[PDB]
Design a protein around this ligand. Structure first.
Ligand SMILES: [Zn+2]
Lengths: 113, 149, 187, 980, 108
RNA sequence: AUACCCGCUUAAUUCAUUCAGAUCUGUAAUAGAACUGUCAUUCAACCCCAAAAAUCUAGUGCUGAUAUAACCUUCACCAAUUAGGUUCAAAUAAGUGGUAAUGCGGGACAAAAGACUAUCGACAUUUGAUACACUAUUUAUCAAUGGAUGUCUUAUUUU
DNA sequence: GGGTTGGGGTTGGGG
């Protein structure tokens, strides 16, 4: 009954299929359909991840960043699982997030999981 | 001892170890990279199960690595108002569904139940990454300072 | 820029310290469990009355100024500061403690804090003060802390004094502890 | 309401209002379905359940019912459960189990020492947790007042809210505090400045709070300038000649003192004694002092400043201030109430409060004027008298405030100095010359330093432990002379009871022996005390702080009241204790034993004072016996033979040293008399001694040899002596040291015994003498009723003890004691009513209003006296001797004693003739009591005839007495001879 | 010359508060409350003028007082007929007390 | 009101001058002549024992049936004593001790009424209500006072 | 920048 949810990125294409993971990022193209937007993950720019949102989006109740989970469709689409949008004042250090992910998961979360 | 930051995966491992190994001349304690009895965790507060007969709210929780459930309790009036003290920051949103990223404390004891201690929400995932990297460094230094003490 | 340390390192240094050694460090911890069974404030003149002569009925007459004065009550609080590494019994000065009480409630002014607390305790407002103290637990902050290995009446001991209290900052405290982790891995 | 009894603590508790549920543990568990009648648990745990007592403000038994089972209760550690329960409290404070706690978020460690914790964690509590379960255990601990039994008459409050804060408390200030006049600050000045001109260090060579704006303050500044100029421009030497002149032989006194200082060697003592007496005669009359002060006042302060009429009234009040004795002070209102706010013209009517509320206006002006007068007296009168006069008293006399001139006292001090012929941060001391007689015997003190005071206290508790140890050792088998340190009636009672036993069995015909010792404090040898200290009958000691609360002396109304009391009237005390590797009772209770009537209580605090070895005491002995820099003004020298006076432990040290000596001496003598037949007893204070024996020859030989061996080491004394006649070697010893005197009815340090009947009296004196030297009076400031009830309970000196527990003595002696102490009681009480009756206000807007009449005097004093008489007729819990069961002689006896009270009151109200108008009413109440008791004495005869129980030894005996000597008319006409 | 009249007094006003309000000025007087109105007599015209200058407000330049928190204007220029009526009423009180004492002597 | 009270006044000029020296004049050996510095932190309650606290409590008991042995009053004030008398509720005094400062003048004839409704429904006399207030205090009204109050004089004499 | 905490009550005996 336990479902894993790792953290991956573009540099991990191979993890998109059949692997329910955790996706984070700031909605760059704030699409108003409230069901499908374009976001940037933990980097500066050009992390153009398609986010097939939950059919409702609190587009103006919170800030830019949104987190969801699920499987990643090959065109970098994200199937909706669970929205956890934040009300952010201090934005991400995407450098810090990337170091955490691709360092812990590289060796120590690997040494853990 | 001191409170340690943990996650669902490691606590599941520790619970399974407590199940299997009797750990003679020990017990009433969970030992990992050393030993511990209390934890701090940042995860998502899960579905609120309504259990009321002797115990109270069965608060579920889940991280990127697992899904666990803890308890709160009162008899008549002991933990209704403090239960609300914990629970306003969930209830007063009125639009968040009932799943938000949150940091809380738990008390470990050698018994198949986990008691919730204190709770608050997490508004920036900077703090979530903080909690994860802190717990990572904490186990690293704990293991390699107890073994290098 | 400044530097940051751990509670365990600070306690280790204090244990390996001698009389008259005061060293200041910065940590990312929180405050919890304020002790209140002892008195919560003291008296001092406007001119910092070193020994204000005592007179009953709450009559104030300083000796460092030697005139009738408006009293200066300074609230002294003791609590425990903790982090993911350790915990220390600490003593908070009136100024920073009143800043914290302003944070929890802006209704009371900074200097008004001691007077308001004294009024509450003499009047019977105790439960509200206890609840407010409860509200201050687990308050993540940046702490500037110094320590002294002095001796208190022919008995050596270790005491601590928190000087500057600052709000936490994930963006750089995470960087601090991450680079510490990187150093540890490299070693 | 019959009387007090042993106790029934469940009734005692449930009989009080605030807590509405009271029970024991066992029946509470039965009610809450946690246990059943078949719950045949361990027997000891069963008595634990029965003796355990619980209470609560609410009947939350419903909250503690079963309501379900869910039987898991698996393995939670009792320590963890208690930790969780403690965490449940959070910010709350002052609960028992709270003590010794470090609440750290959700974690605690254990600190200090808590014997109550060892009482916890028991198998009893383990079973209790098995019964309650998690939540029930935690909430019962947090809520109920848990009381368990450890001792026959020892019960613990191991849990619940601490009884302290429940029993410690006892827009506002309708009258303000009106700061005090520090009359104490007039004592013991040793300062001379070459001239009058009292204080150049004072304001002569500030601010204001609530004056009339500040213009009145400016006027005050102007008038202070006036008085400053007057003070600068007035000589005091001639005024001192006029009112407090020196003796005319002043220069001759100076010359003889100087010659004495030079060469008084060996031809001094008599002349020095006469000189001391003469210098003591240089006192100054209070009236002369008052006139001098009044002239001072007139020369400086404007009668317009003070108002003319208020000025005159204050001038009158000055004599009262001078007259009134030590440890007393007139409050500001004691003058203000006789001050007028309208005798001063320049008073500012700002805002016209007079036209808003003239009473508020007058109150404000009274506040202002009172502050001004406080300023005047504290900054003028007290400094002036302090610099110009030495204020002191006579130790053997008491609180009579004598005055003297500075040069005379300085010369006396020099004469004392010539009589001194006798490491660490040092705890320095200070000398104070104490007038005792036509001679002096000064005292010491320790001052000026917090650390010195604290270590002084440390000495206090460590030697208090030493005194406890020596007390127990003496009680089991006297290491001292045996029956020596009786500490206020213990050994005196045992002594008297045993001697009564032989008078019943052996020979009441006996022979007393007096004995005195001089300078016991200085008869101490350092080396030998250290040696006998190396005997070391106690090591490995430790301390525990005490929180006891038990058994006041007052009855409790039954559940037939016809109000709201709180669970107190078991007044607290405070003691320190000791412990080592010994019996577990001291480990548990932290208190050894104190006899009372059977109501338990015990509560302990947490603290860790460390004193295990006598080596630290040895260090303090090095502190004291070898180095001492006690300075009168600049002196460092000290007599080195003996423990210094003023030392807070010198009494116990002298007791221990004479224990050393009397060890050998008393061993010899007591064993001799044990062989002889043992009709002998002893008692010895610090320097006073009494002896008893029928065989005068044997006892007198004992006196000879004991004085021999005692004076074989340079210890002298001289005072009156015993009826024993010569034993010529005794006469040689008398010629050696002291004269001998003979007189029956051995008198004592404040008691005496008609040893023929062994009837022990205390003292009798005269009204004026009793007024002198001892009387101190309180002030009725919304405290009148409490002040007077407790102050007429000033039978709290000896007349509630020491004499109404002889266990055999006839009612003649009992009532003789009673009415003698009653006489003394009135002799000392009359100042109280005399003073406070002059302010008997029908206008008392609370006391007189509740009184409901303008004759406050009559009924209020009737109430207070009748209430005190009721108290003393209900205080005969001593009188279980003859009344405990007979069920009517209790009333007869207490009414008889009330009759004695009222007859004494009759005599002394005839003495108080000046209040006849309600003296008649008081006498009417008295005669009512008298004649109703005459009827009661008649009725008791029929009651005895109709009742069957006999109790020959006590009940029938006292009935025989009261029938043969108290038959209606007899009672009066035999007890009046017994009065005589 | 020694009379003032307080008008527009709030309904149900007792004499104690109005005499206290006049006592705020601090000058002795005698009051009579009718219907509403309160006619006040002072001892002499000097104190009457003193009361006039004390009760006048320069903001509205008129004689005003505070009654139960409200502002009430008073008039010192008493009409001649009303003053005559008050003098007759006061002399009626005088001779009423005189006749009461007279008849009280008369029963004996 | 009677032995006193009240309104008016008071009456003095080195009793003394320590210790720390410092000018040390006097220096034989010290007077003296002084300057400063003062309790200066005033230091504080000296301790030890011991016996009690209604708590913010108003317990509310013995209903008046007796003392014929209790009670009464005098001296400038108070206290002890003495006697005397009563014996039902009041008339006697003396002694002794202690305490009360001083000069002048008013209280003044041994006191109540007379009449004036004189002064007053504006007067003051309480009670109980309100607003205040408030531990040592009075306010304006309400009722009732009702004569609240002052004015003449007490014996043309033994009235 | 302080921090066990100083004073109320004064009744018999001792010193
Ligand atoms: Zn100041």
């Amino acid at each position: 009954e336990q479902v894993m949810y790792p953290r991956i990125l573009f540099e991990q294409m191979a993890q998109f299929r059949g692997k329910k993971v955790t996706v984070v990022g700031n909605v760059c193209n704030e699409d108003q359909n409230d069901s499908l937007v374009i976001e940037f993950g933990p980097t500066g720019l050009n992390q153009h991840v398609v986010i097939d949102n939950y059919r409702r989006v609190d587009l103006n109740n919170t800030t830019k960043f949104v987190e969801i989970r699920g499987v990643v469709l090959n065109q970098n689409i994200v199937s909706c699982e669970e929205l956890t949008e934040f009300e952010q004042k201090d934005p991400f250090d995407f450098d810090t997030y990337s170091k955490l992910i691709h360092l812990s998961q590289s060796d120590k979360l690997s040494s853990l999981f | 001892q001191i409170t340690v930051p943990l996650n669902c995966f490691m606590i599941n491992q520790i619970v399974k170890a407590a199940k299997e190994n009797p750990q003679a001349h020990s017990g009433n304690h969970y030992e990992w990279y050393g030993a511990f009895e209390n934890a701090i965790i940042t995860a998502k507060f899960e579905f609120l199960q309504s259990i009321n007969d002797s115990p109270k709210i069965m608060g579920k929780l889940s991280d990127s690595t697992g899904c666990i459930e803890v308890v709160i309790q009162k008899s008549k009036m002991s933990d209704e108002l403090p239960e609300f003290v914990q629970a306003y920051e969930i209830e007063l949103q009125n639009n968040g569904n009932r799943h938000k990223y949150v940091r809380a404390m738990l008390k470990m004891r050698k018994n198949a139940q986990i008691q919730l201690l204190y709770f608050s929400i997490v508004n920036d995932a900077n703090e979530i990454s903080r909690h994860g990297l802190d717990l990572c460094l904490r186990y690293l230094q704990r293991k390699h300072g107890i073994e290098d003490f | 820029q400044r530097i940051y340390s751990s509670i365990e390192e600070i306690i280790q240094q204090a244990q390996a310290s001698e009389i008259g050694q005061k060293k200041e460090f910065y940590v990312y911890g929180n405050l919890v469990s304020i002790q209140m069974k002892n008195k919560l404030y003291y008296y001092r003149c406007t001119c910092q009355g070193k020994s204000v002569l005592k007179y009953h009925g709450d009559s104030f007459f300083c000796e460092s100024c030697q005139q009738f004065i408006n009293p200066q009550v300074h609230l002294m609080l003791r609590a425990f500061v903790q982090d993911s590494t350790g915990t220390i019994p600490v003593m908070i000065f009136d100024q920073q403690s009143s800043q914290l009480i302003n944070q929890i409630d802006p209704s009371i002014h900074v200097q008004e804090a001691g007077q308001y607390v004294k009024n509450c305790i003499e009047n019977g407002q105790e439960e509200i003060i206890r609840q407010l103290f409860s509200k201050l637990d687990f308050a993540r902050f940046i702490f500037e802390i110094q320590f002294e290995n002095k001796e208190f009446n022919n008995e050596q001991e270790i005491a601590y004094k928190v000087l500057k209290i600052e709000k936490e900052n994930i963006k750089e405290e995470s960087k601090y502890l991450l680079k510490k982790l990187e150093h540890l891995i490299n070693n | 309401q019959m009387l007090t009894r042993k106790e029934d603590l469940l009734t005692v508790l449930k009989q009080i209002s605030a807590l509405k549920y009271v029970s024991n543990l066992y029946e509470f568990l039965l009610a809450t379905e946690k246990i059943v009648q078949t719950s045949e648990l361990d027997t000891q745990f069963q008595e634990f359940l029965t003796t355990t007592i619980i209470a609560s403000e609410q009947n939350l038994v419903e909250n503690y019912k079963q309501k379900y089972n869910q039987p898991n209760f698996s393995q939670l550690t009792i320590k963890q459960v208690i930790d969780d329960s403690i965490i449940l409290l959070g910010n709350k404070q002052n609960y028992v189990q709270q003590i010794g706690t470090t609440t750290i978020g959700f974690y605690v460690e254990y600190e200090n020492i808590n014997l109550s914790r060892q009482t916890l964690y028991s198998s009893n509590f383990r079973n209790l947790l098995n019964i309650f379960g998690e939540e029930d255990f935690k909430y019962f601990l947090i809520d109920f007042l848990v009381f368990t039994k450890v001792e026959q008459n020892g019960y613990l409050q191991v849990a619940g809210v601490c009884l302290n804060q429940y029993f410690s408390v006892q827009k506002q200030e309708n009258q303000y505090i009106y700061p005090e006049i520090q009359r104490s600050q007039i004592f013991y000045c040793n300062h001379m400045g070459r001239e009058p001109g009292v204080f150049k260090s004072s304001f002569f060579n500030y601010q204001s709070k609530n004056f009339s704006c500040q213009e009145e303050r400016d006027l005050f500044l102007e008038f202070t300038e006036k008085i400053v100029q007057n003070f600068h421009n007035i000589n005091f030497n001639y005024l001192l000649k006029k009112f407090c002149k020196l003796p005319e032989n002043y220069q001759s006194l100076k010359s003889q003192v100087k010659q004495i200082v030079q060469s008084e060697n060996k031809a001094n003592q008599q002349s020095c004694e006469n000189l001391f007496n003469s210098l003591y005669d240089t006192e100054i009359s209070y009236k002369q002092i008052t006139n001098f002060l009044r002239q001072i006042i007139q020369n400086c302060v404007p009668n317009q400043l003070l108002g003319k009429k208020n000025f005159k009234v204050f001038l009158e009040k000055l004599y009262e201030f001078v007259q009134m004795k030590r440890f007393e002070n007139q409050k500001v209102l004691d003058y203000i109430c006789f001050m007028d706010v309208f005798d001063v013209e320049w008073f500012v009517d700002l805002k016209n409060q007079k036209f808003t509320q003239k009473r508020k206006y007058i109150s404000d002006k009274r506040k202002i004027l009172g502050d001004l007068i406080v300023f005047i007296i504290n900054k003028i009168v007290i400094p002036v008298l302090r610099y110009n006069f030495y204020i002191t008293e006579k130790h053997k006399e008491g609180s009579q405030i004598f005055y003297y001139r500075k040069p005379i006292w300085k010369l006396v001090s020099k004469l004392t100095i010539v009589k001194l012929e006798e490491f660490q941060k040092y705890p320095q001391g200070k000398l104070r010359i104490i007038p005792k007689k036509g001679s002096f015997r000064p005292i010491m003190t320790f001052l000026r330093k917090d650390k010195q005071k604290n270590i002084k206290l440390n000495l206090n508790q460590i030697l208090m432990d030493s005194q406890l140890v020596f007390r127990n050792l003496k009680d089991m088998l006297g290491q001292k002379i045996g029956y020596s340190v009786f500490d206020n009636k213990q050994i005196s009672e045992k002594f008297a009871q045993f001697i009564e036993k032989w008078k019943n069995k052996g020979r009441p015909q006996l022979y007393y022996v007096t004995l005195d010792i001089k300078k016991c404090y200085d008869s101490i040898d350092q080396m030998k005390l250290l040696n006998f200290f190396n005997q070391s009958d106690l090591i490995q000691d430790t301390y525990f702080i005490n929180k006891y609360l038990l058994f006041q002396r007052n009855k409790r109304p039954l559940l037939q009241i016809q109000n709201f009391p709180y669970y107190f009237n078991l007044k607290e005390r405070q003691i320190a204790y000791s412990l080592y590797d010994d019996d577990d009772q001291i480990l548990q209770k932290g208190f050894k034993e104190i006899q009372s009537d059977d109501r338990p209580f015990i509560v302990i605090n947490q603290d860790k004072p460390r004193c295990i070895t006598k080596d630290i005491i040895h260090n303090h002995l090095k502190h004291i016996s070898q180095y001492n820099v006690i300075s009168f003004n600049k002196v460092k020298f000290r007599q080195k033979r003996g423990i210094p006076q003023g030392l807070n432990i010198s009494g116990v040290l002298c007791s221990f040293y004479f224990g050393k000596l009397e060890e050998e001496y008393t061993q010899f003598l007591k064993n001799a008399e044990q062989v002889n037949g043992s009709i002998n007893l002893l008692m010895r204070l610090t320097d006073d001694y009494l002896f008893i024996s029928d065989s005068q020859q044997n006892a007198l030989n004992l006196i000879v040899q004991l004085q021999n061996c005692a004076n074989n080491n340079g210890f002298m004394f001289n005072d009156q002596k015993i009826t024993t006649n010569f034993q010529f070697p005794q006469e040689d010893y008398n010629l050696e040291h002291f004269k001998i005197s003979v007189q029956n009815e051995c008198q004592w340090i404040g008691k005496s015994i008609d040893m023929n009947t062994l009837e022990i009296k205390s003292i009798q004196k005269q009204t004026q003498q009793e007024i002198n030297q001892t009387i101190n009076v309180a002030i009725s400031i919304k405290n009148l009723k409490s002040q007077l009830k407790n102050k007429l309970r000033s039978l709290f000196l000896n007349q509630l003890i020491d004499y109404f527990n002889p266990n055999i003595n006839s009612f003649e002696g009992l009532c003789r004691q009673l009415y003698h102490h009653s006489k003394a009681t009135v002799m000392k009480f009359y100042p109280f009513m005399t003073k406070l009756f002059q302010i008997d206000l029908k206008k008392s807007k609370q006391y007189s209003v509740q009184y409901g009449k303008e004759n406050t005097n009559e009924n209020f004093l009737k109430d207070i006296l009748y209430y005190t008489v009721e108290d003393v007729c209900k205080i005969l819990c001593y009188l279980q001797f003859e009344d405990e069961i007979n069920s009517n002689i209790k009333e007869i006896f207490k009414n008889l004693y009330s009759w004695i009270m009222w007859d004494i009151i009759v005599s002394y109200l005839k003495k108080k003739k000046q209040f006849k108008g309600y003296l008649n009413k008081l006498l009417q109440k008295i005669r009512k009591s008298r004649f109703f008791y005459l009827k009661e004495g008649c009725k008791s005869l029929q009651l005895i005839l109709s009742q069957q129980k006999y109790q020959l030894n006590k009940k029938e005996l006292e009935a025989i007495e009261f029938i043969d000597l108290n038959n209606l008319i007899q009672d009066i006409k035999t007890l009046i001879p017994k009065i005589s | 010359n020694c009379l003032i009249k307080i008008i527009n007094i709030p309904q149900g006003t007792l004499k104690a508060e109005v005499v206290l309000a006049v006592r705020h000025l601090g000058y002795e007087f005698y009051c009579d409350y009718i219907d509403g109105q309160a006619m006040i007599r002072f001892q002499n015209s000097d104190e009457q003028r003193l009361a006039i200058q004390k009760l006048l407000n320069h903001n509205n330049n008129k004689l005003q007082i505070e009654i139960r928190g409200q502002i009430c204007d008073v008039i010192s220029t008493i009409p001649e007929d009303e003053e005559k009526n008050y003098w007759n009423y006061i002399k009626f009180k005088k001779n009423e007390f005189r006749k009461f004492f007279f008849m009280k002597k008369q029963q004996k």
